[PDB]
Amino acid sequence: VIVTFQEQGEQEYKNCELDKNQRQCVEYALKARPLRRYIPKNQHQYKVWYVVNSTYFEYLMFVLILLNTICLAMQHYGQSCLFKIAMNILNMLFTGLFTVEMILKLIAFKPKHYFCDAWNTFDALIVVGSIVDIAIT
C-alpha cells in the first residue's frame, strides 16, 4: 500500500496550480455540453410523456415477481399441482404486465432514440425471453 502511495502522489506532488481538486474541477467541468430536449411535443397523441412518477409505484411491482421467484421454494423435493399452476399464472400475468408497460412507454417515446438507453434494450430482451418461455410451453 505504501508503494501505491509513493507511485501515485509523485505524479503531481508539486501542484504549481490552484489545487488538485480545484484544478481537476476547472479542467474537467468546462467541457460541458447541455442537452436541448429529448421529448417531442406532439401533444395531440403523446399524453404518455408527461406521465411520470408511476414507475416509483411499479418499482414495487419489480419486487412482487421476485417473491414469485421464491414461491418455488414450496416445490422442495415435491410439488402441489394447484400451487404450481398458480405460480405459472402469476408468471404469465407479470410478463404480460411488463410487456404492456414497455409497449405503452415505447409506443410514443421516439423509437428512433429508444435504442440509446441500454436499459430499454435489456427490458426488450427480458420481455422477448418471457414471450419465448410462454410460447414454448
The residue ranges that bind ligand CLR (CB under 6 A) are: 70, 73-74, 76-78, 80, 82-83, 86
State in angstroms the smallest separation of the CB of 74 from ligand CLR: 4
CB of 83 to ligand CLR, least distance (A): 4
Indicate the residue among 74 and 103 with the shorter CB distance to ligand CLR: 74
Residue type, 71: C
- Min dist CB 72 to ligand CLR, Å, is 9
Nearer to ligand CLR (CB atom), residue 15 or residue 79? 79
- For ligand CLR, the closer of residues 90 and 106 by Cβ is 90
Q: Least CB distance from residue 129 to ligand CLR, whole Å?
A: 24
Q: Specify whether the CB–CB gap between 95 and 131 falls below 8 A.
A: yes
Q: Which residue is nearest to ligand CLR (CB)?
A: 73
